C-alpha cells in the first residue's frame, strides 16, 4: 500500500531526526552552568495599581517608549494608560466585547484588537479630530483570534484557533501569507528581535519556527505533555521558552534544535498563562493559575522569587523594553507594576 | 495638586471624565440579562430566535429589561479554550429535541442524538465555571414525538426502559433522565419546560426563571445568605 509506504517513510525520517538530535548532545545546561553564583532572592513590591476595568482582563502590551500601556478587558474596553502617573490617556469601546488580544504598534500610531468574532480590528490613534477610529477590520480566519504582534505600521501577523497563522498587509486588507501545519488550536505568537522569523505554540503540544518572508516551517520542537499557552524569544533571538498546562516551562534552543532546560516544581500543579524574559535574559517570569507569578533563574532552574498580589488568575504579563518594571494583569480587573 | 504644571491638571481632568464615563457605562451594563444558548446540530436553536462565524448576538426588551442572547454554533474550535469567557452569564438555555431518540447521526454505527445531547448536557452542567449558573432546559419538537411514540415505542433509546408506552410517561422519563447527571442538586436545579407552540408561554417561562435567578443572586449580595 502506498499509504503504508508513506507512513513508514515518515517514521524512518522521524527516527533519523531523533538520532541526529541525540548525536549532537554532549553536555547539558544544568551540567555546564554549575559554578556560577546564584542570583539570590528577587524581592519586588507593587508600585502602581491601575484600576478602572470592570471585568476580566485578557491581554496587555507595553509601548515601545516603556511608559504607555494598553489593556483589553471583557467589558468591551481597550484602555491606554500612562503608567508613570496612572492617567487614562485613551478609552476605546469595542464593537464586540469578546476580546482576548492586544497589540501596540512599534511606532505608536496604531493598536490592534481581536477575539471570538474572528476579526482583527486596527484602530488609529493619531487622528486630526481627537477621536480613535477603526482604521481596518481584517477578516478571513475561521476561528477565534489569540495573538497579533504588529510588525510594521502596515504589516500584522495573526494566530487563530483554526490551526493556521496569517500575515496581513493592512493597507490592502487581505492575507499576504498563510502558515499551516499545526494539528490543533494556536494560542501564542512571538517574533524574533530582527523580525524575520517567529515562533508559534499550539494545542498539539508542539511549537514551530516559521519564516515570515517565505511562508514555510523550518523546525518543530516537542516535549510538552499538554497545550501550550505562552511563548517568548530569548533576547539574542537564538532560543525561546514555552509555558503549558502541565505546570512546566521549557527552554528550547534554535541552533542545537532540541530542548535545553525544564522549569518545574513539585508543589505547582496549575497551568501557566504567560511567559516573559528579563532584559539580560537571566530571569524567566511566568504567571500561573495560583493567582501569582514566579521568577526562575533561567540558567539554573532554581526559583528566585514570587509575586503574589492578585485575587484571581494572572492572565497577562509583560516587561518594558529597558527592563525597568514588570506589569501583570489578572482576572480581578487590576493591573500591577512591580519594580 | 501643588506640584503639577498647567498641562498636567488638564490631563487629570480628562482622566477623571473618562473614569466617570466608564462608571456610567458599567452601571448601565450591570442590569442586563445575559443568556447563553446551547444545543446540538439541529434541536431548535433557530426557531427559538423567532420569538424575539464566531459569536452571534441578539438583543431585545421584554418588559423594561435588556435581554441579550449569545449563540455559539459555528465555533468549531476547542470548547475548553473559550467556554470560561461565559462565566457569569445570567442563564444557560439548553435546547433538546424530543424527536431525536430514534435517529442516527452521520457516524452511523451506534449513535443516538438523544445520547449525544445527554453527554453535552452533562459536560455543561458539571463544568467548573457553571457551578452556580441556572440552566433552563427546553424540550422542543413535542408534536412529532407524539406521532413517533404511537407506532415506534421508546425501544431503542434506553435498553433498561420499562413501563407503559404513552406520551406522558415517556416524556416524564426523558425529563427525569435529563434532570439526572446534575450532581449539585443542593445548590442548583433545572427549569424544565415542554415547549408549547403559542409563542408566549416560552417567554413567560423564561421571564419567571430569570426572575427567580435574579432573586437568588440578590440574596447573596445583600448578606441574607
Amino acid at each position, epitope marked *: 500500500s502506498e499509504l503504508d509506504q508513506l507512513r513508514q517513510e515518515a517514521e524512518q525520517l522521524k527516527n533519523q531526526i531523533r538520532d541526529a538530535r541525540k548525536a549532537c548532545a554532549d553536555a547539558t545546561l544544568s551540567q555546564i552552568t554549575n559554578n556560577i553564583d546564584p542570583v539570590g532572592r528577587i524581592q519586588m513590591r507593587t508600585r502602581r495599581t491601575l484600576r478602572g476595568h470592570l471585568a476580566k482582563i485578557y491581554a496587555m502590551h507595553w509601548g515601545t517608549d516603556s511608559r504607555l500601556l494598553v489593556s483589553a478587558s471583557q467589558d468591551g474596553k481597550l484602555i491606554i494608560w500612562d503608567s508613570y502617573t496612572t492617567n487614562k490617556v485613551h478609552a476605546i469601546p469595542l464593537r464586540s466585547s469578546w476580546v482576548m488580544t492586544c497589540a501596540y504598534a512599534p511606532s505608536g500610531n496604531y493598536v490592534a484588537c481581536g477575539g471570538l468574532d474572528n476579526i482583527c480590528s486596527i484602530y488609529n490613534l493619531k487622528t486630526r479630530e481627537g477621536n480613535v477610529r477603526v482604521s481596518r477590520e481584517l477578516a478571513g480566519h475561521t476561528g477565534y483570534l489569540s495573538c497579533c504582534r504588529f510588525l510594521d505600521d502596515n504589516q500584522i501577523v495573526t494566530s487563530s484557533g483554526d490551526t493556521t497563522c496569517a500575515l496581513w498587509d493592512i493597507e490592502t486588507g487581505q492575507q499576504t501569507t498563510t502558515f499551516t501545519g499545526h494539528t490543533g488550536d494556536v494560542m501564542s505568537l512571538s517574533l524574533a528581535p530582527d523580525t524575520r522569523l517567529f515562533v508559534s505554540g499550539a494545542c498539539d503540544a508542539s511549537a514551530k519556527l516559521w519564516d515570515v518572508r517565505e511562508g514555510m516551517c523550518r523546525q518543530t520542537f516537542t516535549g510538552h505533555e499538554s497545550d501550550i499557552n505562552a511563548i517568548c524569544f530569548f533576547p539574542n533571538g537564538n532560543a525561546f521558552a514555552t509555558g503549558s498546562d502541565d505546570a512546566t516551562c521549557r527552554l528550547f534552543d534554535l541552533r542545537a534544535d532540541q530542548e535545553l532546560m525544564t522549569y518545574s516544581h513539585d508543589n505547582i500543579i496549575c497551568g501557566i498563562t504567560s511567559v516573559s524574559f528579563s532584559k539580560s535574559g537571566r530571569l524567566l517570569l511566568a504567571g500561573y493559575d495560583d493567582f501569582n507569578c514566579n521568577v526562575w533563574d533561567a540558567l539554573k532552574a532554581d526559583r528566585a522569587g514570587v509575586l503574589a498580589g492578585h485575587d484571581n488568575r494572572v492572565s497577562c504579563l509583560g516587561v518594558t523594553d529597558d527592563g525597568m518594571a514588570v506589569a501583570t494583569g489578572s482576572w480581578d480587573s487590576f493591573l500591577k507594576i512591580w519594580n | 495638586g501643588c506640584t503639577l*504644571s*498647567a498641562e498636567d491638571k488638564a490631563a487629570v*481632568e480628562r482622566s477623571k471624565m473618562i473614569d466617570r464615563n466608564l462608571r456610567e457605562d458599567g452601571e448601565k451594563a450591570a442590569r442586563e440579562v445575559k443568556l447563553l444558548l446551547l444545543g446540538a446540530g439541529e434541536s431548535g436553536k433557530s426557531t427559538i430566535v423567532k420569538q424575539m462565524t464566531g459569536i452571534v448576538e441578539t438583543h431585545f426588551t421584554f418588559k423594561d429589561l435588556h435581554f441579550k442572547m449569545f449563540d455559539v454554533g459555528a465555533q468549531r474550535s476547542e470548547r475548553k479554550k473559550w467556554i470560561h469567557c461565559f462565566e457569569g452569564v445570567t442563564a444557560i438555555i439548553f435546547c433538546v429535541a424530543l424527536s431525536d431518540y430514534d435517529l442516527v447521526l452521520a457516524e452511523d454505527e451506534e449513535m443516538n442524538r438523544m445520547h449525544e445531547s445527554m453527554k453535552l448536557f452533562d459536560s455543561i452542567c458539571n463544568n467548573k465555571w457553571f457551578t452556580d449558573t441556572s440552566i433552563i432546559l427546553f424540550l422542543n419538537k413535542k408534536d412529532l414525538f407524539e406521532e413517533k411514540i404511537k407506532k415506534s415505542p421508546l425501544t431503542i433509546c434506553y435498553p433498561e426502559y420499562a413501563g407503559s408506552n404513552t406520551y406522558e410517561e415517556a416524556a416524564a422519563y426523558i425529563q427525569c433522565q435529563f434532570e439526572d447527571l446534575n450532581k449539585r442538586k443542593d445548590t442548583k436545579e433545572i427549569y424544565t419546560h415542554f415547549t408549547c407552540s403559542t409563542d408566549t408561554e416560552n417567554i413567560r417561562f423564561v421571564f419567571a426563571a430569570v426572575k427567580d435567578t435574579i432573586l437568588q443572586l440578590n440574596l447573596k449580595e445583600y448578606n441574607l445568605v
Partner: single-chain antibody
Amino acid sequence: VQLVESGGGLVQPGGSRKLSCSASGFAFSSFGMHWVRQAPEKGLEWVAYISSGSGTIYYADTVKGRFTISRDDPKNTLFLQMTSLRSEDTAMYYCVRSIYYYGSSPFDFWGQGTTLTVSSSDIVMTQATSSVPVTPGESVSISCRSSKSLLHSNGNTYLYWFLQRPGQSPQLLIYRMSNLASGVPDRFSGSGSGTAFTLTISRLEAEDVGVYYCMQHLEYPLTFGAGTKLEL
C-alpha cells in the same frame, strides 16, 4: 476642520456684545477652547479659556468680571459675552482649540478672526530683534527669552512657536520647544535652554515671511512674546 466666528462690528464705549465660534469637522466636546485677541497693529494677547466639560475657567487680568466664556456642546458653539467695553477692546478675536494628554499638541488649529471696533506676577517673554532682513536660500535664527525658567520638574520645557503670515491666522510650528507640529516642513527646528531659546530655519523660502511669536504654557496667564518680522 474649521471654526467660523460671528459677531464683531462697531460698538459704543460702554455696552454689550457677543462673539460665537461654530466648529465643524472635529470632536468639539474633547477640546478645551481659548479666545485670543490681537490689537490692530500689535501682537497676540490671551483673553480667556474654558476647559472640556466646562469644569475649569480662566480669564485674563485685564478682562475679568466683565467678560464671560460659555460653551454649547450639543450645538457645537463657543460663546464670549463682553460687557462694558472700553476703547482698548478694539481688536481681532481668534478661536483656538487645545487638547491635553500625554503627547498631545495644544494650540494646533487657530480659527479665523472677527473684528470688534469700539468707537471713542506674570512671566515676561522678550524678543529683542523686531525686524530681520533675509533672502531666500539661507539660514535664519530667531531667539526668545523668558524672565522665569520654563523647565518643569518633570523634564518638559513649555515653549511654543507660532507663525502668522501677512493676513492669515497664526499657525503652530513648535510645541514644547523641541517638537514639530504635523504638516510643518522638517527644515523648521527649535531648541534652547531653560531660559534662552532659539528657532532655526535651515533653508528659507518665499512663504516663510511673517511674524514669529513665542508663548509659554507654564503658568496659566499665558504671556506672549513680541513680534520678530521677517522680510525679503
